[PDB]
Point group: C3
Chain length 154, copies 3
């Protein structure tokens, strides 16, 4: 439905987003598998093995929207390629963090990657305003010249 130009600005971000979706499903798969090691309803408490996978998942899930926000913020406002690479790095950290709970690491992981993607977005927004104000200064500059050189055209 969308044009070829704007999809080229998101394609790398979309690929890394799709990889994270596969990863999320893998995490969910691990939880469900560990849930059926117990034998009728789904509970959020259980054996030590289940509680470690469930909590690990819970941490990964709690940080997903934030990661998704900064990834796309960095990719669209600043630059796509670096943001997508840092996005991939976050996924590799998640993978090692999630398996790291399988005997424990802390509640938060990949703080610096979130920070880096956040910084890019700040730089991108500042880069947006710099180009906007330069555009309005160029517009005012041409408008001032036009009124000044106006009678000289007649």
């Amino acid at each position: 439905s969308l044009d070829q130009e704007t999809v080229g600005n998101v394609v790398l971000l979309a690929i890394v987003t799709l990889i994270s979706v596969v990863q999320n499903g893998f995490f969910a798969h691990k939880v469900e598998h560990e849930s059926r090691t117990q034998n009728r309803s789904f509970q959020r408490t259980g054996t030590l093995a289940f509680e470690r996978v469930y909590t690990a998942n819970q941490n990964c899930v709690d940080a997903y929207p934030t990661f998704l926000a900064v990834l796309w913020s960095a990719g669209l406002l600043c630059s796509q390629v670096p943001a997508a690479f840092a996005g991939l790095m976050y996924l590799f950290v998640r993978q090692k963090y999630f398996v790291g709970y399988l005997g424990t690491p802390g509640y938060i992981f990949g703080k610096r990657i979130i920070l880096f993607l956040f910084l890019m977005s700040v730089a991108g927004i500042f880069n947006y305003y710099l180009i906007f104000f330069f555009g309005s200064d160029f517009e005012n500059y041409i408008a001032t010249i036009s009124t000044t050189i106006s009678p000289l055209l007649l």
Copy 2:
């Protein structure tokens, strides 16, 4: 990488989202600090964070729907109010229903606006096509 014109339609929204990211970092940090030192104080901070995390993707959804389909300024302003109400809740240990509703209504209003402009464009096109055919033999 995107053009100047589209980025100007999402910039106010993106700032609010980034501030919410810092606030999410703050909430997660406050939980992390209490996790290192089960506890009666830990359960209050964990639940508060969990209550914010559970509502966050819904908020992010209505903020961006209202901003893109309706008007950016009121949506971003309401989004900033949500992060203020969110902040006060984390001190006292569902919040901001009325804000979520306001953004939801903005989106629906923006959607209704889209269709009005679409059908008007359809009406205008059909009207010009109707005159064009009946007038064609005259030239």
Copy 3:
């Protein structure tokens, strides 16, 4: 703020998202009413399980809609919500559903996105193939 043409490519995705927001509010309301117990644990777990999966759903819904085709994506998203309703009420006897629901819908929206990306690269390479083809003739048929 966005132009009519681009908003036209996201309307159905927006509507679905908005219905899902209503459903999230319903689930959250069902939790708050129960919080004034086993009845509370089940509603909380059902909502939590739904919430956990929601951003993954929202990601593939829009990816599918934007990259592949809006109508099939929006309808599949709508199907996801019906399944999500049966799943939530299924927690509300000693037996409940598992942790995962609507995974085949997620898979379908995923595969749409992949297909939409492969569609992008096909037109792009064809666009460079055309560009390179024109440049070859423009050099050959030139000194005339």
